[PDB]
Each structure stands twice: as C-alpha cells, then as structure tokens.
Design a binder for this molecule. Structure first.
Ligand SMILES: Nc1ncnc2c1ncn2[C@@H]1O[C@H](COS(=O)(=O)NC(=O)[C@@H](N)CO)[C@@H](O)[C@H]1O
Ligand SMILES: Nc1ncnc2c1ncn2[C@@H]1O[C@H](COS(=O)(=O)NC(=O)[C@@H](N)CO)[C@@H](O)[C@H]1O
Ligand SMILES: Nc1ncnc2c1ncn2[C@@H]1O[C@H](COS(=O)(=O)NC(=O)[C@@H](N)CO)[C@@H](O)[C@H]1O
Ligand SMILES: Nc1ncnc2c1ncn2[C@@H]1O[C@H](COS(=O)(=O)NC(=O)[C@@H](N)CO)[C@@H](O)[C@H]1O
Ligand SMILES: [Mg+2]
Ligand SMILES: [Mg+2]
Ligand SMILES: [Mg+2]
Ligand SMILES: [Mg+2]
Lengths: 441, 441
C-alpha cells in the first residue's frame, strides 16, 4: 500500500495526486478524503491517550505523597483509567479501519501512462518482426507456410497433449502433455533459466503453496475472490500461488538492504507452476493450453533502489523482447491503460505475440514496476522509512509460449523446432512430423 | 479391488487364498466371510426380484384378458408392486455394502513375498556399489572424500536452497531451490525423461489436480486421511496428487486394449510435482529436502497383459537400478514384507540408496506390481472380464535423489557434478564450490 504520509499535506504528501490516480484507475476518489478524516480522528485519540497518561502519572505520583486522603485521588485514578481503556479501544479500531481503507487505494499511476478505461487506447510502444517475415498475417513466421492450423490443432496432430483424458480426470481445461509436448515445455523452462542466468539472474524455484497471512501481503482482494485456489491441510489452509511473483516478492520480507549501492539490484529468475481458477473466464479460449488452470512460468523478479527502478523496468521488458526475438516470434509491446492496471502496478507493459492462425496479437508477457507498494507491506527496506522498489515481468509462461511457437513453426507435414530450443530436447530434432490427422480436415 | 467371483467357491474363486493374504497383510480376515454372506443375501434378493417380475408379468397379462373382474387381479398387482419396490431398495443397499466391503480387501499378496509385519525381515534382493567404492561407510562414494556433511549441510554450503525463507512463507518443510539447486533438480527431471524415453517410454506430464470421484478409484482410504491435500475451487473440491501414478493410472480408464499382443505393453515416463501432507510424519527428517510436502518425480507407469506383468516388474526395477548405477550411487534392492504393502500392491521392491553421512540405506524408489486391482476399478480391459495389469515404479524422486547425490559427491571444497547430469546444466560444470560456511563447523 501507499505510505500513510502520502495522504497528509501537513506531512509532505499530496492527496490530490492520489485522487487523480484513483480517477485514472476508475477507482474510488472518495477513499482519499475518508482516509484523511480517519487519520485525524486517530491523531485526536493518540493525543487524548497521551494526555491521560500524563494525568495518570501526575495522579498516582500524588497518591504516593498523600500515602502519609486519599479516596479522592483514587476515585480519579479509576476514572482516568476507565476513560483510557475506552480510548485504547477506539484508537486500535481507528488504526484498523484506517489501514483497511489505505489498503484499498491503488499505487500512484505513473504520469506516462495513458488515462483510459479502454484497452483500445493502449500505447503502441514497439513492434518487431523476424527476418523474412514481411508483415503479420496468416502465415507462420518461422517457416513461411500458411498458418492453416490453430495452436491446439497443431498440438493434437503432433500427439503432444491430451485434452480429452485431461478433462475426464481434472475437469474443464485439464490436460496431460505428451511426448514432444513435454520436451518443448521443459525446453522453454531450461532455456528461460539459462537465458536469465546468463544475464546475472539467480535461479529461484518457489514453493507453490503460501501461508494465508503472507499471501495477503502481496495479493489484492480480487485475486482471493476469483483467482486463487485454497488448499485444505488438516485444520489449516494455504493458497496455491498464481505466479512465482507472489512467494518471491515475500522472499526478502522484513529484510534490509542497508548498503544498496553494492547490494542491489537483486535479480531472480523465478520458476514455478502457477494455478488460477479463471473464475471469470468461461468458455473463452476453450481448447488448447493457451488459457488453463495450471501452467509453468519463468518469471523475472527484481528489487532495486527507488531511484533506479524506471531504468530497470526498461531493462526487464528488453530482456523479454530479446527472449522472443531469439525464438523468432513477431510481437508488439503495448503500454497498458490506467484502467487496466492492478493495484500494485504504477506502470505496465505487455508483450503480445503474433498468432498467425488467430491473426491477432495475444498477451504472452506482463512487465510491471510496482515501485514500493509491495515492499512497504512486506517491510523490505532500502538504505538509510525508505523501501526498495519491486518489479516483475513474465519471461515465458511456457504452455502459452508453446501455443505461439506451434502456430508460427507449423508447416504442411509437421513442426519445425525453434533453433535455440533444439539443444534442450533429446535428439536435438530440427523438425517433428505430424502423427495424427484432425477429424475435421 | 478384487473380483467379486474371487470370493465365491461356486464361481471358481478361492476365499481361502484371500483370507491367507489378509492375514499376511495384518488386515481383517473376517471381511472375507462377511463378503460371502452379503453376496448370498444379494443373490437371494435378485432371485426374489426376478420372481416378482415373473408374477407381475403373469398378472398384468391376466388383467388384459379379464378386460372383457378385475379388482382382485389389481389388488394383487399393487401388492406385488409394493413388495418389488421394497426388494429393489434392499438389493441396491446390499450391492452397495457388498462393494464397500470388497473395497477394503487388499490385493492378493504374491506367494514370493515374505510374510511379516516387521521390515527387519525385508528380503535382501541385491546390492550394488560403484567402482572404487570398497564398501558402504562414511565416505562419499563418487569422490572418496570423508562424508563429513549431511545432504542438508552440503546444500546449504552450496547456497542451493533456502529452508529459512521457505518456512516463513509456506510453513514446516517449506523451501525454495536456488542456483545449482534449481539446475540439479531440472537436470534429474530431464535426464530421467531422456533415460526412459530411450527405453521406449512415452513422456507424459500429468495434471496435479484430480476430480474426487476419479481419485477415489485409484487411491486407498488411508491416503485421503493423512496424505492428500484438498483443493477448494469455488463450490467444488479437487485433490492434489501424491504421485503421477494416480492420474496416469486413470489415463486409460474405461478403455479396452482389445489386441494386446500388439497394443501392450504401454509404458509411460510420468512427470509431475507431488504433494503430501505427511500428516503422520512429525519431526522425522526435519531439515533438508529429503522429506518435504512438495517434490518432483519421474515415474514409470506400465500396463501389460496379465501374463506378462511379472517379467515387466523385473524390467522396471532393472530400469531404476540402471538409472542409479549411471549416477554412481550405491544401493540395495529389498523385497518389502507383506505387512508393509499398500492395498493395491501384490508385490513391492524398494531401492534404498546409501547415504554415507547418515551411514544408512534410505528409500529412493518403490516398484510395485498391482496386477489388476486398479484396472478392475478403472475398467481398463485386456483382450477377449479380463483387465490389464498395472505396475508403477519410481524412477527418480528428484529432491530426495539430490540429497543422495549431495552426500556421495561432496568433497572438502565443494560438490562434484555427476558426469551424466553435466550436459543438462548450463556451463556443464564438473564441480561447484562451497559458497557459504556452516554456522557450527
Ligand atoms: N525456420 C526456422 N527454423 C528453425 N528456427 C527458426 C526458424 N526461423 C526462425 N527461427 C529461430 O528464431 C530466431 C530468429 O530468427 S530470425 O528473426 O529470422 N533471424 C535469424 O534467424 C538470424 N538473424 C539469426 O539466426 C533464429 O535464431 C532461429 O533460432
Ligand atoms: N490462465 C492462464 N493459462 C495459461 N497462461 C496464463 C494464464 N494466465 C496467465 N498466463 C500467462 O502468464 C503470463 C503472466 O501472467 S500475468 O497475470 O499477466 N502477470 C504475472 O503473473 C506477473 N507475475 C508477471 O508474469 C501472462 O502474460 C500469460 O502469458
Ligand atoms: N568422481 C566422479 N565424478 C563425476 N562423476 C562420477 C564420479 N564418480 C562416479 N561418477 C558417475 O557415476 C557413474 C558410475 O561410476 S562408476 O560406478 O564408478 N563407474 C564408472 O565410472 C565407469 N564404469 C563408467 O564411467 C559414472 O559413469 C559417472 O558418471
Ligand atoms: N514426502 C516426501 N518428500 C520427498 N520425497 C518423497 C516423499 N515421499 C516420497 N518421496 C519419494 O518418492 C518416492 C516414491 O514414493 S512412494 O510413495 O514410495 N511410491 C509412489 O509414489 C509410487 N507411485 C512409485 O513412485 C519415494 O521412494 C521417495 O523417494
Ligand atoms: Mg485496477
Ligand atoms: Mg497480464
Ligand atoms: Mg497394508
Ligand atoms: Mg515407498
């Protein structure tokens, strides 16, 4: 969340900036005034508590002297004490409601972000096409072949996954990966780790379960509602993670980078499976492994000094671009409109790759600067309270990245294996043949 | 479960064999007599239902004729019908209780299994040591160095995992893998897949969630009690899998290998994460990644003709032995006593590898022939009811396999990388240095 003092003009903050941000977000502007009011009530209670302590100390110090009368001093002590009890209770309630309200306020939207609720207004930041690919159309970028099949059709013809047995065993969107489906997924995981490791990222495999209290410090309420699976463990509960961002953001909770010039930035190549209920996503992207309930993801997670996060943000999206360029996948980078930012993000870029069968750009990567919104909550201090900035960016959500590869590397008789992945696959195949026909053809 | 007819002498079965097996298992022998009694009650009801149908048909066929009187035929129809209703209800209840009882009976213990409740009596099947390793002692097998550190100490000195941040974020046994911890885990996963794929196994990545009704057909009750995590999905529930054995065993549920000579055996190299509450395991193996709540495992899963399963069982444990030999890890293979077999297993071998710091053999692999116990429940038919046999065997539970490597590949200044894994790790290191000191030293 934002610092309390950010709401307080008298403390150096600017509530106006916060209201403007709320407006850009399409979120409550009223929250800001309410937060300010409750803060003043809290301060009043704190002063009153202070005064009662002063009176109490004065009174019991008098009782000591008249200990030589003194049922009146006692009568007042009991009075002041009873009042103090009440004040103590109100203060704690006020602090609670104040923090609850502040928790609802999204991070300050960066001035460079387009103010809109309509993704049609996403900023077109950059476009990239591979060599020998004239323009985005219904043509597999890597092979030049007609993009005749969708990703799920390609994967079926390759005998690379099993949605039918998947659905019977797990329910909707359930799947097994098979044969080269497994090998390609592993290839992306290992290439991704190797790729980031070469750039100084530390490989970090995160647990996929988190304690509720920790999850609550890094995920917003809406995620608990329609995103996260709850785990029952005897009499206890945990959550399954939606992204390694969650546990890795808490990795340095309560720690202090007290010599940041030498200690930061810290860069993690996160790897985990990810689990999402997709509770608001019915029917959309029904077949294939494009949108599923469980998937693997190589994540960039970085902590930097507050003064260096914006440069790091550029470095991180640049890292993902280089990764997709290395796979020969056409893409565009877009600046997400204010109305589509989650609470933690001050700025977000998505990399959307070209799917030639769909003939559409589809999101493969989100890259966010969350400044100190999460680190304040997790108490991750920086230097000299000053907190580190946290940024996160997809490197590769592997099953969805496979979908993009499938459409762009297809040809008449099968699938060309992207050159950079070959060394990660037994036999280092350059090409794998279609094994099955589609029922429809 | 076993076939109903197995309990019925008149149907060609031998209840005596089943009672002897129950006794070997240390399980209820009474169950068998009860199952036989309830079957007879069920048969009685079936005959009575049959007779009522005959009478009813006779009666309503008379009512048709007197339709030319006839309130007596009607009075009897209503009588017979009311009786039939009751019989129908009793029959269904009997069938239910009969199957419930049969479900409690473990598979027939193979005659070659030692009859005992005490693992001290496990059969010592085979022992193996690598080259230049005289005998199992407190010496790292691969390097000849003193086995000075436990697996968790080695992993800590390598900065290869983080149990402290793991515990804070997930709770007891929680961990992150870091740096070469991640690379070694991936190395084992990919080597294992490549290894089995070269032997004709089909790589199959299983989903880690299963519908309750399907899980119930392959897991025994005790697993639901202290092993499986339940998942909350809105108003629905699923289970997390304890092993890819579970979903892969259900992969061919309701299918029919009608030309088994050509269609079987079918061999899967299963890969998944695995989740276990270890609810009955408090404090034991407290530190390290030897016994954890989440781990990866490459699994052998095979379906064969009933007449070929015993030969396949030998092939499968042989495959695992070859795998550990290739890693240079000393081990023994033991025939598990009858009293330690789960319900599905007719026979089980464990491969237990030498941990030189612990100076003990520790289980890394279980290999089981479950004959047709699971396939009967999942309706996986074979030829010409005749069901396939199912077998399963660990190839590598990767985190625990890492523990064995750590103790056996340690030397004074760090860890030698097993030769076969080198190609799976960026830089193909032959050795990685200790990075941190232990607090205690
Ligand atoms: N037809 C293909 N077969 C295999 N890999 C391909 C194919 N097309 C593109 N790629 C992969 O995608 C990457 C980007 O390809 S590219 O944009 O066309 N450029 C190049 O190929 C060269 N600039 C470098 O190889 C390549 O390095 C290659 O690994
Ligand atoms: N339900 C899903 N199925 C398959 N892939 C998904 C699913 N949801 C998200 N992804 C993939 O994972 C990527 C990152 O997810 S995200 O929600 O957008 N952002 C994050 O999780 C951040 N931690 C950055 O990775 C998406 O861009 C998409 O490529
Ligand atoms: N000191 C070591 N360094 C790296 N790898 C080792 C070491 N010791 C054993 N291994 C691995 O474990 C395997 C089995 O080793 S062995 O039993 O001693 N036998 C041999 O090394 C030879 N028979 C084949 O290399 C070897 O193939 C090797 O890959
Ligand atoms: N809690 C755990 N933590 C780490 N590894 C475990 C844990 N439980 C089991 N394993 C590893 O997984 C292996 C197989 O597990 S098993 O329960 O014995 N058997 C199975 O699951 C069978 N499907 C065969 O693999 C064990 O031999 C052990 O090496
Ligand atoms: Mg928002
Ligand atoms: Mg996104
Ligand atoms: Mg038993
Ligand atoms: Mg076992």
């Amino acid at each position: 969340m934002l610092d309390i003092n950010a709401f307080l003009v008298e403390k150096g903050g600017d509530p106006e900036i916060i209201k403007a941000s709320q407006k850009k977000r399409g979120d409550s502007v009223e929250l800001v005034d309410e937060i300010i009011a409750e803060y003043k009530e809290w301060v009043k209670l704190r002063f009153d508590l202070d005064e009662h302590n002063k009176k109490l100390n004065s009174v019991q110090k008098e009782i000591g002297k008249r200990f030589k009368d003194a049922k009146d001093l006692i009568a007042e002590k009991e009075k002041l004490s009873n009042e103090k009890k009440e004040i103590i209770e109100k203060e704690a309630e006020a602090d609670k409601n104040l923090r609850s309200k502040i928790n609802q306020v999204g991070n300050i939207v960066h001035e460079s972000v387009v103010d809109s609720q309509d993704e049609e207004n996403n900023e077109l930041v950059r476009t990239w096409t591979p060599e020998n690919y004239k323009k985005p159309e219904q043509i597999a970028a890597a092979t030049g072949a007609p993009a005749k099949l969708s990703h799920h059709e390609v994967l079926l013809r390759l005998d690379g996954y099993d949605p039918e047995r998947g659905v019977r065993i797990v329910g909707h969107r359930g799947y097994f990966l098979r044969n080269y489906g497994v090998f390609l997924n592993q290839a992306l995981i290992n290439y991704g780790l190797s790729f980031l490791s070469s750039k100084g990222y530390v490989p970090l495999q995160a647990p996929v379960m988190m304690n509720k209290e920790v999850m609550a410090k890094t995920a917003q309420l809406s995620q608990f509602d329609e995103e996260l699976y709850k785990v029952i463990d005897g009499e206890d509960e945990k959550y399954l993670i939606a992204t390694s961002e969650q546990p890795i953001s808490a990795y340095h909770a309560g720690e202090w980078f007290e010599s940041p010039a030498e200690q930061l930035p810290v860069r993690y190549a996160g790897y985990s499976s990810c689990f999402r209920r997709e509770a608001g996503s019915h029917g959309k992207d029904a077949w294939g492994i494009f949108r599923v309930h469980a998937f693997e993801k190589i994540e960039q997670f970085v902590l930097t000094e507050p003064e260096k996060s914006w440069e790091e943000f550029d470095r991180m999206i640049g890292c993902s671009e280089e990764f997709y360029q290395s796979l020969g996948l056409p893409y565009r980078v877009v600046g997400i409109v204010s109305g589509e930012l989650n609470n933690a993000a001050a700025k977000k870029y998505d990399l959307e790759a070209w799917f030639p069968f769909q003939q559409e750009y589809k999101e493969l990567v989100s890259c966010s600067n969350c400044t100190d919104y999460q680190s304040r909550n997790l108490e991750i201090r920086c230097g000299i309270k000053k907190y580190v900035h946290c940024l996160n960016s997809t490197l590769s959500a592997t099953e969805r990245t496979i979908c993009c590869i499938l459409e762009n590397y297809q040809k008449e008789d099968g699938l060309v294996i992207p050159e950079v992945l070959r060394k990660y696959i037994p036999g280092e195949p350059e090409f794998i043949p279609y094994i099955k026909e589609l029922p429809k053809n």
